[PDB]
Amino acid sequence: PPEPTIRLQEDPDPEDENLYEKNPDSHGYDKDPIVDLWNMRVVFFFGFSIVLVLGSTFVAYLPDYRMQEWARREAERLVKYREANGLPLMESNCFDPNKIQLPEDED
Amino acid sequence: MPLVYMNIIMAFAIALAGLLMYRSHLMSSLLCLEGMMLSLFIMSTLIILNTHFTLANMMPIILLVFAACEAALGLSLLVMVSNTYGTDYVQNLNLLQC
Amino acid sequence: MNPIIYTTLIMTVMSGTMLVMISSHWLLIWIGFEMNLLAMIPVLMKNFNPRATEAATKYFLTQATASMMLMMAIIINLLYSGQWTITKMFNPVAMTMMTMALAMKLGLSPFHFWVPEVTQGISLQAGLLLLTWQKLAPLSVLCQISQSINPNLMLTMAMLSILIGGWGGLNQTQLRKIMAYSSIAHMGWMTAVLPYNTTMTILNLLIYITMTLAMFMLLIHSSATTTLSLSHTWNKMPVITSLMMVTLLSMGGLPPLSGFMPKWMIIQEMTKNESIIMPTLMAMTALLNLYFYMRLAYSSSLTMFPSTNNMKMKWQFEHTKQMKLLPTMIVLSTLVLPMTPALSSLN
Amino acid sequence: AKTLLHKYSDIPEGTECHRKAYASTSIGGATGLIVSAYSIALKPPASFLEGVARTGRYTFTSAAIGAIFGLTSCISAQVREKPDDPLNYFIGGCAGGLTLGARTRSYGIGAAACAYMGLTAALVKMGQLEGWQVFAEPKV
Amino acid sequence: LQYGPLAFVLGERTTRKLTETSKVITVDGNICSGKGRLAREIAEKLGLRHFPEAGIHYADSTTGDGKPLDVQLSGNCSLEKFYDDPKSNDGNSYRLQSWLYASRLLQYADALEHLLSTGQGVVLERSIYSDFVFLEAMYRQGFIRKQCVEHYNEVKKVTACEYLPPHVVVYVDVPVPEIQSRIQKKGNPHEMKITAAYLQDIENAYKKTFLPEMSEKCEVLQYSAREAEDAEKVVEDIEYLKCDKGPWPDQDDRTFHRLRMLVQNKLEVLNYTTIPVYLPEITIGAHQSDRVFQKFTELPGRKYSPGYNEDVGDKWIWLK
Amino acid sequence: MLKIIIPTTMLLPMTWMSKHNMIWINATVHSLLISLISLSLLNQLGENSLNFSLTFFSDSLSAPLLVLTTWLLPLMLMASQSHLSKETTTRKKLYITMLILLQLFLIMTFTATELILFYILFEATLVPTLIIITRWGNQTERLNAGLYFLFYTLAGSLPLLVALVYIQNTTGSLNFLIIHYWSHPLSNSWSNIFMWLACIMAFMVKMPLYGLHLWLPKAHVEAPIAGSMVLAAVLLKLGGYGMMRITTILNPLTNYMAYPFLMLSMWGMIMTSSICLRQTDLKSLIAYSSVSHMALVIVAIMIQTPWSFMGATALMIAHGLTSSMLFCLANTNYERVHSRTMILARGLQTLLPLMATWWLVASLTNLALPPSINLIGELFIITASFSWSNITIILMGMNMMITALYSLYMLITTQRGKYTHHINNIKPSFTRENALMALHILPLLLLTLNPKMILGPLY
Amino acid sequence: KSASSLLDLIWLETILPKTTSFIQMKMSIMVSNQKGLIKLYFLSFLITIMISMTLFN
Amino acid sequence: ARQWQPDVEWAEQFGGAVMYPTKETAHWKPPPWNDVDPPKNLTLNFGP
Numbered sequence A: 001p002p003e004p005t006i007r008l009q010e011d012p013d014p015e016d017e018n019l020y021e022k023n024p025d026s027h028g029y030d031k032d033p034i035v036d037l038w039n040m041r042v043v044f045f046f047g048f049s050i051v052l053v054l055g056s057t058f059v060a061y062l063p064d065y066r067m068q069e070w071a072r073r074e075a076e077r078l079v080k081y082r083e084a085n086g087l088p089l090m091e092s093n094c095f096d097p098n099k100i101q102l103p104e105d106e107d
Numbered sequence B: 001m002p003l004v005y006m007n008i009i010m011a012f013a014i015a016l017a018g019l020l021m022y023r024s025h026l027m028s029s030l031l032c033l034e035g036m037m038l039s040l041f042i043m044s045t046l047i048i049l050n051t052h053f054t055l056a057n058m059m060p061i062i063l064l065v066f067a068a069c070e071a072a073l074g075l076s077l078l079v080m081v082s083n084t085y086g087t088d089y090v091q092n093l094n095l096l097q098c
Numbered sequence C: 001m002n003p004i005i006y007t008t009l010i011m012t013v014m015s016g017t018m019l020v021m022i023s024s025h026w027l028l029i030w031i032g033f034e035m036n037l038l039a040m041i042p043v044l045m046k047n048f049n050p051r052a053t054e055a056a057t058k059y060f061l062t063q064a065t066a067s068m069m070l071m072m073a074i075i076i077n078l079l080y081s082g083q084w085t086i087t088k089m090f091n092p093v094a095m096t097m098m099t100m101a102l103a104m105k106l107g108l109s110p111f112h113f114w115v116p117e118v119t120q121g122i123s124l125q126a127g128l129l130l131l132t133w134q135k136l137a138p139l140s141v142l143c144q145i146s147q148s149i150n151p152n153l154m155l156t157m158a159m160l161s162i163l164i165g166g167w168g169g170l171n172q173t174q175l176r177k178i179m180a181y182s183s184i185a186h187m188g189w190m191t192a193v194l195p196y197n198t199t200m201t202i203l204n205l206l207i208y209i210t211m212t213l214a215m216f217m218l219l220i221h222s223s224a225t226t227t228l229s230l231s232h233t234w235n236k237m238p239v240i241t242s243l244m245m246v247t248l249l250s251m252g253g254l255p256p257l258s259g260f261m262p263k264w265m266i267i268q269e270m271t272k273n274e275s276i277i278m279p280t281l282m283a284m285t286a287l288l289n290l291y292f293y294m295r296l297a298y299s300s301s302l303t304m305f306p307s308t309n310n311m312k313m314k315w316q317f318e319h320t321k322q323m324k325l326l327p328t329m330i331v332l333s334t335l336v337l338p339m340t341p342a343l344s345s346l347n
Numbered sequence D: 001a002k003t004l005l006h007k008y009s010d011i012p013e014g015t016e017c018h019r020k021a022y023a024s025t026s027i028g029g030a031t032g033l034i035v036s037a038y039s040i041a042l043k044p045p046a047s048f049l050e051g052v053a054r055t056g057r058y059t060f061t062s063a064a065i066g067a068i069f070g071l072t073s074c075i076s077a078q079v080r081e082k083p084d085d086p087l088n089y090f091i092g093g094c095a096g097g098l099t100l101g102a103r104t105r106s107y108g109i110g111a112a113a114c115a116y117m118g119l120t121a122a123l124v125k126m127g128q129l130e131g132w133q134v135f136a137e138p139k140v
Numbered sequence E: 001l002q003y004g005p006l007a008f009v010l011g012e013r014t015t016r017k018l019t020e021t022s023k024v025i026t027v028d029g030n031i032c033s034g035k036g037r038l039a040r041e042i043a044e045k046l047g048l049r050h051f052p053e054a055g056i057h058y059a060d061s062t063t064g065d066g067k068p069l070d071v072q073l074s075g076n077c078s079l080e081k082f083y084d085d086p087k088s089n090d091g092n093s094y095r096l097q098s099w100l101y102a103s104r105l106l107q108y109a110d111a112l113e114h115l116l117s118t119g120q121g122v123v124l125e126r127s128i129y130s131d132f133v134f135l136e137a138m139y140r141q142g143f144i145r146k147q148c149v150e151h152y153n154e155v156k157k158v159t160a161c162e163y164l165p166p167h168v169v170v171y172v173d174v175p176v177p178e179i180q181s182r183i184q185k186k187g188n189p190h191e192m193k194i195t196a197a198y199l200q201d202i203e204n205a206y207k208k209t210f211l212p213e214m215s216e217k218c219e220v221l222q223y224s225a226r227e228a229e230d231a232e233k234v235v236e237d238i239e240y241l242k243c244d245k246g247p248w249p250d251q252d253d254r255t256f257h258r259l260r261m262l263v264q265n266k267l268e269v270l271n272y273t274t275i276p277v278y279l280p281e282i283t284i285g286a287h288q289s290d291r292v293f294q295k296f297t298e299l300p301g302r303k304y305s306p307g308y309n310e311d312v313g314d315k316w317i318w319l320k
Numbered sequence F: 001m002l003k004i005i006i007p008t009t010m011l012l013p014m015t016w017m018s019k020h021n022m023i024w025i026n027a028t029v030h031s032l033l034i035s036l037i038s039l040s041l042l043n044q045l046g047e048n049s050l051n052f053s054l055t056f057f058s059d060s061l062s063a064p065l066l067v068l069t070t071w072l073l074p075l076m077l078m079a080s081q082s083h084l085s086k087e088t089t090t091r092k093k094l095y096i097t098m099l100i101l102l103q104l105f106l107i108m109t110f111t112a113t114e115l116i117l118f119y120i121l122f123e124a125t126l127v128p129t130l131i132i133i134t135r136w137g138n139q140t141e142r143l144n145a146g147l148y149f150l151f152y153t154l155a156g157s158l159p160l161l162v163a164l165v166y167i168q169n170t171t172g173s174l175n176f177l178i179i180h181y182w183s184h185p186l187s188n189s190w191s192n193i194f195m196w197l198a199c200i201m202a203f204m205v206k207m208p209l210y211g212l213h214l215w216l217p218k219a220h221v222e223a224p225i226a227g228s229m230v231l232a233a234v235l236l237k238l239g240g241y242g243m244m245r246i247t248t249i250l251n252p253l254t255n256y257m258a259y260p261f262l263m264l265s266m267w268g269m270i271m272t273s274s275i276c277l278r279q280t281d282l283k284s285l286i287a288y289s290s291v292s293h294m295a296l297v298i299v300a301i302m303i304q305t306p307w308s309f310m311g312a313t314a315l316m317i318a319h320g321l322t323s324s325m326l327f328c329l330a331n332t333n334y335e336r337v338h339s340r341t342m343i344l345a346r347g348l349q350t351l352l353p354l355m356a357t358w359w360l361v362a363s364l365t366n367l368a369l370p371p372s373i374n375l376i377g378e379l380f381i382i383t384a385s386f387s388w389s390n391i392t393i394i395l396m397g398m399n400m401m402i403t404a405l406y407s408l409y410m411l412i413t414t415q416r417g418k419y420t421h422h423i424n425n426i427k428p429s430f431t432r433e434n435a436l437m438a439l440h441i442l443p444l445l446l447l448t449l450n451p452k453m454i455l456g457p458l459y
Numbered sequence G: 001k002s003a004s005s006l007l008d009l010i011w012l013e014t015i016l017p018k019t020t021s022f023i024q025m026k027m028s029i030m031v032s033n034q035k036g037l038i039k040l041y042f043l044s045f046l047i048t049i050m051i052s053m054t055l056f057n
Numbered sequence H: 001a002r003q004w005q006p007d008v009e010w011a012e013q014f015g016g017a018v019m020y021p022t023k024e025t026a027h028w029k030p031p032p033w034n035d036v037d038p039p040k041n042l043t044l045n046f047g048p
């Protein structure tokens, strides 16, 4: 069996490289310290300072396009009107029956 | 539709079936093709002559000519195939398989 | 051969196709088919070897039988009506024999057996020409008499072609046989919409022609005819493998690629005529074509196969002969889905 | 041709069990003979006698499958007193699948055949009820 | 106007260039024989073009700049290692043999292209023919396995079935003790380790196989050490003889056109030197292949096409 | 809507023109800016919708998904920054291009005023995901995984296309607005039954349903970290969005047809939660947890009540964020240990305390601790199902108990106990990873302050 | 035993993916296994021509 | 530590004449690398 016991010419599997040996204060972003530091800074500034704070403030103070206060005030004025005249609050029929034309069965 | 046309079409069908059986001898395949051509010529000639389609009398000759040229081409191919094996056996052409 | 002779033969093939396309007489259509067949054989036998000669003689046998059947159908149609013009077929099974002859010319199932054989035997350029240009004339004739077909027979043959292409492509290692089975499946897709809309047939033919041209010219650029031979291309031309994988994804019918446009349209057209089961079956069968395309893509670009030491020398050389239309073909076969409504141009 | 289809379809589903079984057996024999012809044309096994034996085996298998499917489908439809119900066709199909499996002598294949045939028969009955067209005529 | 079908159609026919002095000649000899001197003298006297024997970095001398590249980027083998440890574990021997055969194929293609394009003849050292003898010897000495010679035979058949053999084969015959003495006098420390059995095997493979096989399609001039000293007699023998037995007489314009299109476009010449047959000596893994290809790309004038490399100094890129 | 789409398209030339060492910085900064721009879509109305044009419209169902899709890209880049360090610049640019194409396809999918355009983009999302899985995966099974992830999807989606065009031949339109305003009841017919199945199964395969969930563990385990995040966070929600959009035309046939799928989901959540208990793989455990949560979302959509829809929307958003965070944590462990087995690396709280805190928070939010939005969606779905039938509460309680069990099991196995002695290559956690977990977790606890932003159009 | 191995790893895998792979592989082997003899192909073509002449009319 | 890439054993699966070899197709051989197969003057005696 003169086979070399090697299936092919393969590079040996490299060992994992640690970013902390060649650069303490490594931030885990890049091997180049300057690119590393600036990547950390841009990530922190645009993620935490810009989006997370300003976007949260923007969402918090969104104008009432869902018309919650409008609906509340409409309901208050309507119930004030109906309590005054004694109408029985909300009617059971959403649409008035006189404008509906039922089909006569005659069965 | 008369009986002579049926007989000619039966001859064409028999020649086609013989071409499609393929016992051996690709030369036999060429012979079957030429038999089908002869049947086509005969029946087209009968149809054209019977109805007095004067101009269509060009059509048979043309057909013949063209088909005969085909035969030549086929013959040439056969020779080259034989030039590889020495015989025109059908089963010799098994190098290509689906 | 002599370049003048090759040019003359190519022009004769094109002239035969054009004579089939522009003529209104059945005899002239037969003559054009005969001229195309006559000029096609030496193109298939440019590179002289026993395999090429065998493929050429098989192709000649099939095409001559188809031509004789076509002439027989013409003669019966003349017998039952003294008409030579290409119109409604005017008769029963004379039309059946015309459909069978055109199916044998196109390679539709069950007359598909010659396509893988001839494609494997001949070279890549001959395969390109055979699988691209040799479909125009029979498809044009079918489109002209599309109001005459029996829809049952045409639809049966189209479904059989799709099934056979899908199943046969799964077992192939040679690239040319894969191309042949892909052609069979695409022809099956093309002919299943002929009874309903010939415009969709022509659109599918254009898309398939563009995709097949891009595929074959990529295969010619990276001169490999086998899966393992193609697996070595990444170590010399990675960009070719990437474009090849994108083209393969397009050929599988994946949106938003171009190959999705025909099937989509066809399916839509087929639902306009209350046909629901058959488009569904067609899509489920095209999944097989997609599978073997994906296997080829796996072997080609998505994984890096072992190479050889001699390949290093090939790193020092550049392709002397370049195909000008390859980038345009790739772009057209990949990125023209947004331009779909332009099919109103009656392409 | 369509003669066998007409013969099978003309008979009412809940009556004439024997006639339905005969029509189904005829259709099965026809398709088995066609499959045997295709197999012989594509693959000549060893000789004339082996070929005719294979033809007989395939034809009798297909005829048996058709017979079993028809009797079960018709008997179930008659006893259940609910004609035009795909469930009877399913059961008939399931029975047919089981007999194929018994012929080939495999529980898996028999089990597989029963499930698939039951589905195909139910789909065919549903298409007959709803008018589904496998080969749609050109409309627009 | 780069040569192609258009040039052939218009004017370009290579039969009119042949003036009975093309006569491609290959000079063959054993190791440390004076075949190179005889080839150079033949080329000088007959007015032909001499091709020095192809080495490891022959291909580097024809592409980009003529300077050789790194050993790991070009060849991945060395003759010094083969001389030192002919039975090395990493399969360097057959890797060397395959790379050398491919280099010889490229050199033969270049020589044929020059002959067909200019009409001037060429003189070559050991060609793709007779390259097998080393392989043969390497098999009998136990340096390489039978799978290596089988792969070599496959590649040699598929490649060499496309070319015209040389018009004249010149052989210099020297006894083994004499070139052992010449090897000792040479002064190369790695060459001192060549055994007598290896040289005897090379010489046996030459006479037993090469000369009888070339005799039926070429014209052979067997010479010894003494009468190979004078090149005048060799040139007189070359001029007196006329070749009418090989494949050259039956060639014509179209065959020459096909051969010229084949010898150009070296990528197709070397197409079958990398067939997907996996021998552990020559196959290279994906990771090493990727790393080495990336290193080759990072070479100064190799990232783009020859005329599109800014770092080398190519200008007007954006308008080419 | 183009104010979001055009910058996403411009992300590609910027990525390809960037310097060899500035691709990550540019991509991250501009993706964060695009997310900030997309935040403007959250201003919805109680009226119909935000109909920008004939092609794209927004909704309070579409807006949270769009915001999550935009926000996921910077996190994907930050997590992919680690294991792509030894990669050539061209291939890193190609990876970023795949991510950008995926984001663009998702953005155009979620607006999609028309159903055929929705289908086209819904399938267009397949290609970049398949390439990412099968090209930048580590093991040899990735190829197989890709095949599964492809064909399953197509097996469900090709029938849908047919159904879609069929509808356009009868109704005359596929626009969502016209479909809603002109909806007509579906007669209980076999043809209508199969139309229902064709419309439904394409989206049920992507959730995935319990019977059709086999592709998900393979695809999640084999894909790289960015692929796992995009699969678990957004791609699973495409099916829920599709069902929510398409169930309008299926009534009243949904009442009868929903029973098999309701049974499958209600039993499959229990089955997959139990499967999570016996798992030797972290990624497989997280994938099966995703399957359970999406089974609950399927139940919610099938019940078809307003509370069901609100709870389903909230649960999709919450599960996306939580599953992405869990996958990131497991990836941080794997990049140190290179094994991806739970039992091997133990006692990590002693070595990495802050990472243990991140693990605890992620497990707590996966366990549906109130008042997290996970719990809000869970509780809304449970209440709607209880109104549907009072016996569902047994299955939901079982699911909650098993969920808590396996979540705390995963936390305790990896963080608590005694450290493995021979494992000595565990370096301190980088700033990048801690920032990644913080950016995953802070939006959840901010959204619990304003739940109505993720409660859908039925709020 | 049941949820993980019996159902998820075996039977749910057996039904949809494995059965499809087996059926497609068997059909591919059946269809693609042709010995390249034009005799068999021509006999099949004749059988098909006869069947279509006897069935589609 | 490194991404898995196909080895010789994986690649040898795709080197056969067809996919899925069977007992009937086991004897099939891949076609030659170049599509050329090996190819594998009379005398007359005029007497008196």
Ligand SMILES: CCCCCCCCCCCCCCCCC[C@@H](O)O[C@H](CO[C@H](O)CCCCCCCCCCCCCCC)COP(=O)(O)OCC[N+](C)(C)C
Pocket: A051, A052, A055, A056, A057, A059, A060, A061, A062, F039, F064, F067, F068, F071, F317, F443, F446, F447, F449, F450
């Ligand atoms: C480290 C230890 C602690 C130190 C810090 C001590 C201080 C603690 C205080 C922090 C939390 C304690 C609770 C105090 C709550 C006060 C703030 C709260 O009241 O405001 C909320 C406001 O918060 C926002 O509504 C929620 C935040 C927005 C969430 C969006 C996420 C940010 C986008 C980033 C990408 C998103 C990714 C996920 C995709 C969806 C509720 O507002 P609302 O009652 O209504 O009305 C506001 C006033 N109006 C009437 C004028 C409108």
Ligand SMILES: CCCCCCCCCCCCCCCCC[C@@H](O)O[C@H](CO[C@H](O)CCCCCCCCCCCCCCC)COP(=O)(O)OCC[N+](C)(C)C
Pocket: D085, D086, D087, D090, D119, D122, F188, F189, F190, F193, F210, F211, F212, F260, F261
């Ligand atoms: C693999 C993991 C899960 C995958 C997805 C599974 C979910 C899909 C299951 C589909 C749901 C059921 C399909 C049809 C439901 C209709 C209701 C029917 O089952 O009930 C009776 C129907 O009776 C019988 O069921 C008839 C059908 C019997 C044949 C069907 C096969 C049964 C088992 C097959 C299951 C295999 C599924 C997977 C296929 C690959 C009611 O009797 P009837 O009043 O008359 O019919 C009412 C409907 N009408 C009005 C339109 C006529």
Ligand SMILES: CCCCCCCC/C=C\CCCCCCCC(=O)O[C@H](COC(=O)CCCCCCC/C=C/CCCCCCCC)COP(=O)(O)OCCN
Pocket: C274, C275, C276, C277, C280, D119, D123, D130, D131, D132, D133, F152, F155, F156, F159, F162, F163, F166, F190, F191, F192, F194, F195, F196, F197, F198, F201, F205, F212
């Ligand atoms: C994850 C993999 C699962 C695969 C998805 C399977 C479920 C999808 C259903 C199967 C395909 C059906 C597509 C139907 C397309 C919609 C069109 C439609 O519904 O119109 C019907 C068409 O209905 C049909 O034709 C249905 C025929 C089905 C043929 C193919 C059957 C495929 C296998 C079905 C068995 C499996 C059933 C359950 C599958 C669940 C998933 C496992 C009406 O037809 P017309 O003739 O035009 O109406 C006039 C007369 N009233």
Ligand SMILES: Nc1ncnc2c1ncn2[C@@H]1O[C@H](COP(=O)(O)OP(=O)(O)O)[C@@H](O)[C@H]1O
Pocket: E030, E031, E032, E033, E034, E035, E036, E053, E079, E097, E100, E126, E131, E134, E135, E191
């Ligand atoms: N096919 C081959 N295999 C291995 N080594 C070879 C081969 N061909 C040539 N060489 C080496 O090339 C060297 C030069 O050859 P040689 O003719 O002996 O010297 P010189 O060039 O001075 O005449 C020698 O050391 C020889 O071993």
